Curated annotation (Swiss-Prot), chains A, D:
Post-translational modification: Phosphorylated by tyrosine kinases in response to T-cell antigen receptor activation. Phosphorylated in mitotic cells. ISGylated.
Domain notes: The PIM (PUB-interaction motif) motif mediates interaction with the PUB domain of RNF31.
Residues with Phosphoserine modification: 16
Compartment(s) of residence: Cytoplasm, Cytosol; Endoplasmic reticulum; Nucleus; Cytoplasm, Stress granule
Phenotypic consequence of residue 233 to F: In IBMPFD1; uncertain significance
UniProt organism field: Homo sapiens
Identification of the protein by name: Transitional endoplasmic reticulum ATPase
Gene Ontology annotations of biological process type: aggresome assembly; ATP metabolic process; autophagosome maturation; autophagy; cellular response to arsenite ion; cellular response to heat; cellular response to misfolded protein; cytoplasm protein quality control
GO CC entries: ATPase complex; azurophil granule lumen; ciliary basal body; cytoplasm; cytoplasmic stress granule; cytosol; Derlin-1 retrotranslocation complex; endoplasmic reticulum
UniProtKB/Swiss-Prot annotation, chains B, C:
Protein name from the UniProt record: Derlin-1
Keyword check for Zinc: no
Complex formation: Homotetramer. The four subunits of the tetramer are arranged in a twofold symmetry. Forms heterooligomers with DERL2 and DERL3; binding to DERL3 is poorer than that between DERL2 and DERL3. Interacts (via SHP-box motif) with VCP. Interacts with AMFR, SELENOS, SEL1L, SELENOK and SYVN1, as well as with SEL1L-SYVN1 and VCP-SELENOS protein complexes; this interaction is weaker than that observed between DERL2 and these complexes. Interacts with NGLY1 and YOD1. Does not bind to EDEM1. Interacts with DNAJB9. Interacts with RNF103. Interacts with HM13. (Microbial infection) Interacts with the cytomegalovirus US11 protein.
Function as written in the Swiss-Prot or TrEMBL entry: Functional component of endoplasmic reticulum-associated degradation (ERAD) for misfolded lumenal proteins. Forms homotetramers which encircle a large channel traversing the endoplasmic reticulum (ER) membrane. This allows the retrotranslocation of misfolded proteins from the ER into the cytosol where they are ubiquitinated and degraded by the proteasome. The channel has a lateral gate within the membrane which provides direct access to membrane proteins with no need to reenter the ER lumen first. May mediate the interaction between VCP and the misfolded protein. (Microbial infection) In case of infection by cytomegaloviruses, it plays a central role in the export from the ER and subsequent degradation of MHC class I heavy chains via its interaction with US11 viral protein, which recognizes and associates with MHC class I heavy chains. Also participates in the degradation process of misfolded cytomegalovirus US2 protein.
GO cellular component: Derlin-1 retrotranslocation complex; Derlin-1-VIMP complex; early endosome; endoplasmic reticulum; endoplasmic reticulum membrane; endoplasmic reticulum quality control compartment; late endosome; membrane
Cellular localization per UniProt: Endoplasmic reticulum membrane
One of the GO BP terms on file: establishment of protein localization
Gene Ontology MF terms in the entry: ATPase binding; identical protein binding; MHC class I protein binding; protease binding; protein-containing complex binding; signal recognition particle binding; signaling receptor activity; ubiquitin protein ligase binding
Stored Pfam families: DER1
Main subcellular location: endoplasmic reticulum
Record gene name: DERL1
Tissue: Ubiquitous.
PANTHER family according to UniProt: DER1-LIKE PROTEIN, DERLIN
Length: 261, 225, 225, 261
């Protein structure tokens, strides 16, 4: 698997660049100015542009702090890189400022920061990303909440942007689908062990399990006293193995409207 | 309950001023109030004489007689039933755009009809509108009557074949499909897969003539180079 | 996703090209790029002057009008849906024999059309190939969407009745059946009746252009013990 | 014409053996270990090895599912048998794996499956046959597309077996060997025997039953604990006798919508 790659510090400070060694780009058949998808932990995705670098080792990827925050990784970790040549030119985006960066600015952000940054830049961005802009005296932090088309886009001169709105906070609700894992579970050692034993294989490697020809489990009933936190168990398992946990509540399904439930 | 008034009011603005027009012009021709000979878009007289009334009026008339009314009825039905869909989606928040594209289509079709010797005009424009809708709503599923499961981006060709086999006159649908495809390139596909600069910008005087909606994300600006 | 492209590509090359030409030529003829009067195979014009322009095109041309749409549709349907069936059997790995047969039938039909007065030499070739397929697939229970227990080697006469009641020109389809019968007698029944050398021998030119596809053994390993 | 016989289920699980009663062998001058030719419906032919069995009656011939499928016949039908000691040792055989069993194997098929199965077996084969080989966790099925000499040949130690090529698609005649038959039911001999008794005539020879003028049974109630294999029994009966099995589910019919159920 020539996709796992260790990380390293960056030389250039551009947000949307990664430094690659020449043999690696030869092996993966990537050319300069193209777009690739970077996937890591916590189901975090990013888009970047491949750049050349002789100094960097073949197994090492040179990459800066903002991408590391976006991917929720650290130094010495592993990141997967995949090609993405179907990147789609965007039409309209909505960008908002973070709460603790616009204290005492009281100005138009379109021309001071956004226009100098996005001119002839061709910077691809994805929904939910956090990026920094250096200007006069403050490092303004911005969040992308929507893009057309979603989630992949490229900033172009003939695009319309909207940055008018209240300064949004940092996370608010982005912790339920986040770091919560095995470290936030107590008093369930045996049951968690059994669940991990009977669920790890059919979710991590589905193709091999299909190839073998053995029926996977189709239903599990976690029964016990209320308030023990079973939904947190399921959320932790889904967020750890890697899935699309989709919660369905009882009462809201019941009383929607007569026969439309 | 006057269903006529309520139904007319429920019709969206632009189509309300188009539909009625194309069902009112033929009557004048059929009742003989105005001579139909002045309503056939003769190209040579248009070139030599002024004949400014020819293009605006010749695109709204179709003689109806013994057994030619069925094509008119089905064309009008498709026009209404798909122009409502075209206004309610896609071209929804841009009333000027739905009008600018119609004028662009009309200019192109009158140019190519002056080049050719075609008499009538509404059918190719209807085909162009239908095609520009169909190319935008791919991967759907619809059926006319016989439980058929044609997906999308085929219906213009299907009705092309339907008109072709049952009768003739195939040029005045190809000439509309080509114009629709040209508009689709010049509006959506070209400055979206290569990055070329926009060549179709709606003038601001249309916006001052007809106001736009209030966008969800406040108001936006164009970057440029 | 291009369903039409994949469907076209799954078709065998012989019949894909035949179908493509048979569909393309009438559209060009009706479109007015060339006058239809230039492709009719007039016997006297070909007899007196050379006129190599119209011995072949009349086979691939058909002046479709609002009288014969159904006939054209059913003819092309049967052609498409039986050429592939003939390809799967019989000439499954010998396309050169298929080209030999089609060329033989076309030459015979054009000669007999030179002798007779028929002008559109498209139906007889389809009738001949359908007749030979029916005669090479005898005692087979054939049934279309509504056919109950229709027997083989009778479909040519059923389509004889269908074409005679819908339209006319019975001479062309009779002579097509005649040439089909002649080829069938001289190709397969001749060696088993008389035992002489096959007069219908394909020259090596077609083998050079279309070599037959033989088996591909590949590489293997001895079992041993 | 003392050659017509009626087929019946077999006890031996080998794919190239048929069980016979000794009086038939004596009458037909067939010795143990001889290779005989079988002709059936649709002008399909097969080759088999004759083995003596006391249990089977004179008029009945025992054969497993693969031979019956090759002959395109069902239970209780009639076939033709003849001797053919003129079989000659083969030179080379080309075999291919059917596509809808080999999904995700990625390996050398000859060593794993074909060599253990064909070793010291002397199995006779014919062009166009289908034979099933048990493996690791699947049951592969192979088709013979070419042989030399044709059609009768014997697999011998001095043979070059070619098994490389694109997998064959389905014949489109069905007869999928992955379905359920009388060999996939155990522990229900008596009830299956009763059902096979009183379902056979109304589904095998309807014309004779109508001519006789006798009322056939119209309903059967299979009752027992859940998970004891009733749907499997019904499917096996339908697939063996030959029918148009149509399954109606309780919950599907019940809650479709209000009145149009
Ligand atoms: N001989 C057998 N007797 C009972 N069950 C069997 C037998 N062979 C297989 N099974 C199993 O029975 C299952 C089918 O049971 P099913 O008929 O659905 O039960 P129910 O009739 O209660 O719905 C299959 O998954 C199969 O694994």
């Amino acid at each position: 698997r020539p996709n796992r790659l260790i990380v390293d510090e960056a030389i250039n400070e551009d947000n949307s660049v990664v430094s690659l060694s020449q043999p690696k780009m030869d092996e993966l058949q990537l050319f300069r100015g193209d777009t690739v998808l970077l996937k890591g932990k916590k189901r975090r995705e990013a888009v970047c542009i491949v750049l050349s670098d002789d100094t960097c080792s073949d197994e090492k990827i040179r990459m800066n702090r903002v991408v590391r925050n976006n991917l929720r990784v650290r130094l010495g970790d592993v990141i997967s890189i995949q090609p993405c040549p179907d990147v789609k030119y965007g039409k309209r985006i909505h960008v908002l400022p973070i709460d603790d960066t616009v204290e005492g600015i009281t100005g138009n952000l379109f021309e001071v920061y956004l226009k100098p940054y996005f001119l002839e830049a061709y910077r691809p961005i994805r929904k939910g990303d956090i990026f920094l802009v250096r200007g006069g005296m403050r490092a303004v932090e911005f969040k992308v909440v929507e893009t057309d088309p979603s989630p992949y886009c490229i900033v172009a001169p003939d695009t319309v942007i909207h940055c008018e709105g209240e300064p949004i906070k940092r996370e608010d609700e982005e912790e339920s689908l986040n770091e919560v894992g095995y470290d936030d579970i107590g008093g369930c050692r045996k049951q968690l062990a059994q669940i991990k034993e009977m669920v790890e294989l059919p979710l991590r490697h589905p193709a091999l399990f299909k190839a073998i020809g053995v029926k996977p489990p189709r239903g599990i009933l976690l029964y016990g006293p209320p308030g023990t936190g079973k939904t947190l168990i399921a959320r932790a398992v889904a967020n750890e193995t890697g899935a699309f946990f989709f919660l369905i509540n009882g009462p809201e399904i019941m009383s929607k409207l007569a026969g439309e439930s | 309950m006057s269903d006529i008034g309520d139904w007319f009011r429920s019709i969206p603005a632009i189509t309300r001023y188009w539909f009625a027009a194309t069902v009112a012009v033929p009557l004048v021709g059929k009742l003989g109030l105005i001579s139909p000979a002045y309503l056939f878009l003769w190209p040579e007289a248009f070139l030599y004489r002024f004949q400014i009334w020819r293009p605006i009026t010749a695109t709204f008339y179709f003689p109806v007689g013994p057994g030619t009314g069925f094509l008119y009825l089905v064309n009008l039905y498709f026009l209404y039933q798909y122009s409502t869909r075209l206004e309610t989606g896609a071209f929804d928040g841009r009333p000027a755009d739905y009008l600018f594209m119609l004028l662009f289509n009309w200019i192109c079709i009158v140019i190519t009809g002056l080049a050719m010797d075609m008499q009538l005009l509404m059918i190719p424009l209807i085909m162009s509108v239908l095609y520009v809708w169909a190319q935008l709503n791919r991967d759907m599923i619809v059926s006319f009557w016989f439980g058929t499961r044609f997906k999308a981006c085929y219906l213009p060709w299907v009705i092309l074949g339907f008109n072709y086999i049952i009768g003739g006159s195939v040029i005045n649908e190809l000439i509309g499909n080509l114009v629709g495809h040209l508009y689709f390139f010049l509006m959506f596909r070209y400055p979206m897969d290569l990055g070329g600069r926009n060549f179709l910008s709606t003038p601001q005087f249309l916006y001052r003539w007809l106001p736009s909606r209030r966008h969800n994300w406040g108001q936006g600006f164009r970057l440029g180079d």
